[PDB]
């Protein structure tokens, strides 16, 4: 990625010649970051610790200078030259700004400041603006994590009402799959990152790279063997018994958990006849559990249909509220989940006698790419400048921060000056992160779960 | 950065736990790539060859190997340290495939191979496989590519009805500004840079970057100064004609070129109640109304303060002075806005587009349904077709055997065919990568050559 290794190129264009625009005599600047409503009335604030750790991540360079002055010549934009020189030379090259955020994990309703940054140098004012479009970035990751985190509140929902142990179960419950179908390795592992605030099961290799190296989690997630149908089928149809047989042989151990998907050729019938009749006793043998994966038919139905088969082969215990939990096997669905299809297929199966424990949710694409800045209305404004000596404002206005109500756990903006008047029942949410280069507050991903305690 | 630089865990964590799945006598494998529909009838194939520089850009090592054995354990998947040890002392840590692809910039219909991946190695064949993960990410680029292809052909088709310089004009016509709107620095880089192949103007610096690395093009696109409408209101509203002012003293010379964003309304009062000398063209980009009506207004309005001239075609071209659209644009309603100004009398010279997270982030892997499946095996000396029953595969493998694409002689159409079989056609793919050597590289002018050749 060294060919992205300048900071002064990680930016729109347009903001190399903005320092020109501001008012003569400008000082100072303060920015806020905040959701502007969309779909979720709430967001999981996650990933500025990783932005921050990976965009600046070394001293600005004279070198860095010459290479953004060339490129942004020829390619039409003036720039700031004299003034990126005398950050160099004076400041030591680090960006003169403070930025301020709610602790990572904790979940804020919308239309409130979950970030502020500003300028903490009076000749170099402009630098929070240039930083606006890597800054901005951090949509992503909230957004991400708020998803992963509305779908845990309905899956514990469920939980609660039919399963005997639903916090030993939730981790498990939402497993990430989505690298193939997201935009960039960086994004997969920032997104897959953002998932991992919530739950354990991870395919994206890259989210536990992230998550070692910038959240100080060695093991961030964990996953289980599973076959592909490339693999099934690579023996023929023929020896389809053959080929999941291998798949116990190699993964079947007691304690172990083997995800096989079955509809290469008919899922009733590998239900009803491989898996539930001529492998079954090896199954109960093995000690293991079989997690059976559609990967066709309506999303909903056949799931269904799946727990039927498999209770008509394999039985079940009923549990201590009332609900059919199967006896070695279990299904999990990756194919067209979404939270409203996740939710309908929780109703369809407890509806029809069965613990929220036999299954579990895949989502691939739809949690890691089918996300925008609007999905959360994501904005960063500029709300105050100091000029002549004073602040003037630029509808939420002047130097911001968070409350939080210490009776209550309520949120709420404000300006500054009332985190003093308002002593009493509210405490400032927000906490220093970062300032003239040094990171002054880090999370551990204990941490940011620890903090994603919201419930709703 | 260097925390994702391990190849060998740039996958999904099952590929991990893969080789073991295949039949005893498995010793090949080979795969296609194609677009199985969408919203677009056809493709421009971009980016593969960024992906393969930038996710295969080293020998893998022993080093590599321990620390993907030591996290994949504790993430809980076996791991072929043997067979990766075997690559990296019998191969010097070069993967084993050989990838052939259809010339970047190239526009495909879909239904067609794109690309192949086939296995060189007998011991090491469930390499390609292992690398699905990182492969078909080249959606990305192939879709933002396509989209912005797209955008180019209409706009094309009201330039050459309305416009004394249709392909003098083209170029500047769709301008990305998604670098804010992207979910990470390297999708805004590889997709910026997908936008390049068909336009010039861009504001994502990162996608110069990646032109320049990886496609050997060191300026690869333009940009303007631009006023930020939060920075114009920091003057105050007293001052805000002061503000516009500003910008034209600081960047308005004679060849020069400056966008100013407005509200719609400032735009009417500046010119019907009132509120040239530089040389410079001025583009105005409104920011508020919708977006088919408020273009059509203001070049009426721009039209009255600053005149026009009839150009050869009979169509209207104002006089210092462009619009731009950057709100709301997606390709249907940019149609709707040539169609009004054009039923106007004005020529498309005169408005230019602006896409952001609309071209870098709204789009997903199903845009144009994106597939890439393992088609043949060989076992047991014998090469088989691999697939699910038609029943199950829900059409998401249209091919099976050993593929390539064609390019008809007579009529220049593509054909997808089995190799075994290839008349009047040539081979339309080339061999673009084989055991750790990039053997065809694209410059971006070779590039866009391709896809400006593309036509419909």
């Not at 500003?118 to 240039?130: C, G, I, M, N, Q």
């Not at 151990?253 to 009803?272: K, L, M, N, Q």
């Not at 949690?367 to 925008?372: A, E, I, P, T, W």
């Not at 609007?374 to 709300?383: E, G, V, W």
Request: net charge negative; charged share 20%.
């Amino acid at each position: 990625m060294h060919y992205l290794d300048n900071l002064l190129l990680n930016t729109d264009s347009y903001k190399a010649s903005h320092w020109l625009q501001y008012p003569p005599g400008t000082d100072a600047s303060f920015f806020y970051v905040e959701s502007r409503g969309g779909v979720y009335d709430q967001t999981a604030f996650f990933g500025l610790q990783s932005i921050l750790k990976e965009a600046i991540n070394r001293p600005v360079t004279h070198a860095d200078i010459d290479d953004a002055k060339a490129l942004l010549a020829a390619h039409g934009e003036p720039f700031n030259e004299a003034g990126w020189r005398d950050i160099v030379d004076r400041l030591g090259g680090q960006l003169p700004i403070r930025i301020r955020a709610v602790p990572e994990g904790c979940v804020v309703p919308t239309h409130n400041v979950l970030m502020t940054i500003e300028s903490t140098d009076a000749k170099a004012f402009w630098v929070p603006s240039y930083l606006e479009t890597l800054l901005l970035r951090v949509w992503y990751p909230v957004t991400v994590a708020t998803v992963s985190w509305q779908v845990k509140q309905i899956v514990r929902d469920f939980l609660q009402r039919t399963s005997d142990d639903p916090e030993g179960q939730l981790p498990f419950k939402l497993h990430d799959f989505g690298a193939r179908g997201v935009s960039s390795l960086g994004s997969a592992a920032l997104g897959g990152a953002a998932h991992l605030v919530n739950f354990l099961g991870t395919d994206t290799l890259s989210a536990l790279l992230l998550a070692r190296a910038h959240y100080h989690t060695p093991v961030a997630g964990y996953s289980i063997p599973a076959a592909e149908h490339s693999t099934i089928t690579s023996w023929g149809r023929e020896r389809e018994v053959d080929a999941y047989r291998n798949m116990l042989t190699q993964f079947a151990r007691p304690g172990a958990i083997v995800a096989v998907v079955s509809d290469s050729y008919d899922i009733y019938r590998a239900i009803r006849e491989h898996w539930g009749t001529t492998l079954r006793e090896e199954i109960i043998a093995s000690g293991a559990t079989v997690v059976i994966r559609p990967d066709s038919g309506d999303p909903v139905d056949v799931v269904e249909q799946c727990l039927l088969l498999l209770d008509e082969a394999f039985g079940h215990q009923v549990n201590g509220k009332g609900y059919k939990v199967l006896n070695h096997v279990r299904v999990i669905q990756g194919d067209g989940i979404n939270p409203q299809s996740l939710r309908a297929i929780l109703e369809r199966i407890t509806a029809a006698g069965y613990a929220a424990d036999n299954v579990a949710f895949g989502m691939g694409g739809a949690l890691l790419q089918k996300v925008d800045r609007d999905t959360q209305k994501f904005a960063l404004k500029c709300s105050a400048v100091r000029v002549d000596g004073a602040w003037i404002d630029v509808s939420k206005r002047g130097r911001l921060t968070l409350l939080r109500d210490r009776a209550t756990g309520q949120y709420r903006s404000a300006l500054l000056d009332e985190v003093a008047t308002h002593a009493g029942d509210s405490d400032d949410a927000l906490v220093t992160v970062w300032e003239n280069g040094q990171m002054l507050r880090e999370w551990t991903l204990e941490q940011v779960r620890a903090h994603a305690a919201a419930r709703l």
